[model samples]
Target: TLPRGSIDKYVKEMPDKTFECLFPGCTKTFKRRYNIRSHIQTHLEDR
Candidate 1:
């Protein structure tokens, strides 16, 4: 598990950071701040 606010900091540090879903069949790669926020929703939904 990651610490709170850590993701935000990382994203801030690397404005071009890209994140892809770890789950199979999920090919999403968030490249922007807003997109990252949307990507986070998937994790919360899974929980």
Candidate 2:
């Protein structure tokens, strides 16, 4: 599976270069872009 949409809008590239989940109140951070992408999908599924 893949998201060809605006994943950048939901997964923020932090100052430290970490991927932070920007879904509303989500504060989860990831070291890998792939991990963040997978994580973001979960949020979308719940909605």
Per-residue lDDT tens digits of candidate 1, residues 1-47?
85565234323324556555444455556654466655555655575
Best by TM-score, which number? 2
Error of 1 at 12 (Å): 6.2
What's the distance in Å from true for residue 13, model 1? Answer: 5.5
Best by lDDT: 2
lDDT digits (tens) for residues 1-47 of candidate 2: 96578565787776676877878878888864577887777777776
Candidate 2 lDDT (Cα, whole model)?
0.74
Quote each prediction's TM-score. Answer: 0.31, 0.62
**TM-score, predicted candidate 1 vs. hidden true structure:** 0.31
Report the Cα lDDT for candidate 1: 0.51
lDDT of each: 0.51, 0.74
